[PDB]
Structure 1
Amino acid sequence: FNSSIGRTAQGKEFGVTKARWPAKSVKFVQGLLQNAAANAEAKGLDATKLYVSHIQVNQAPKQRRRTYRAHGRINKYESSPSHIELVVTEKEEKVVRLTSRQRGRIAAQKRIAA
């Protein structure tokens, strides 16, 4: 989702040119990354080996509002909320079939070089 975004030098570490700083999105992930990491101590996991194995964002139901347009018209003004979920994990540290020719060739090969 990057049409007509601005360009920055800070995208170079990822090989892109369009990159932003979604302050409000980061706080919500930081809240869930803190909650999920907190779950790992209550489960007894090792925090030094934790990594984001699965993170998933879904469209929550839209919250409706209203905007008023020229010539007495009305258009929607909706929010696009999110469902976020994430998982953090500890690091982790046959038949052959031969024709009679192939059997004989293998047998002749084993009798030709010893």
Structure 2
Amino acid sequence: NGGVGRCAQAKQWKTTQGRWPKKSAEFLLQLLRNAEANADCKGLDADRLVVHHIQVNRAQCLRRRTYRAHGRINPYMSSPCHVEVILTEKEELVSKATDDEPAKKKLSKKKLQRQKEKMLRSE
């Protein structure tokens, strides 16, 4: 977050701090290129795909070194990435419907005799 500087284009995200990570946003187009080119061979129609799950993981770092005042050496570490997409097609979504199981006993409606069935329809 900090100290990234506050931009104009970030009212849209209800934030103030935003930025324009060009090389970051360019590797996520070369990724979504493969994730679209994999829906091709499966036969999915790309204008209905939705990015279902996206995550980035930090990969193993790489070693370089600065050189400091009074004769010292500090680490200069590049921190790479691991990105995963799964894109799933979106149709008219009938979502889910859980199962029903009976917990039935036979003395149900004799203590309910005086209460529910022959008790007439009120308002």
Scaled to the shorter chain, the TM-score interval is: 0.7 to 0.9
Alpha-carbon distance in structure 2 between the residues aligned to 1:50 and 1:7: 33
Structure 1 counterpart SS, 2:78: coil
Select the residue among 98, 111, 114 that pairs with 2:118: 111
TM-score (norm 1): 0.87
More deviation, 44-53/102-111: 102-111
Name the counterpart of 1:37. 36
- Give the number of the structure whose residues are more often helix, by fraction: 1
Report which structure shows greater RCO (CA 8 Å, sep ≥6). Answer: 1
SS in 2 for 1:42: helix
Q: Please state which structure has a larger fraction of its residues in strand.
A: 1
The two structures, once aligned, show a CA RMSD in angstroms of: 1.8
Shift of 1:76: 0.3
Q: Which runs of 5+ in 2 are unaligned?
A: 93-100
Aligned length: 111
Separation in structure 2 between the aligned mates of residue 78 and residue 9 of structure 1, nearest angstrom: 32
Give unpaired runs (5+ residues) of structure 1.
none
Length-normalised TM-score, structure 2:
0.81
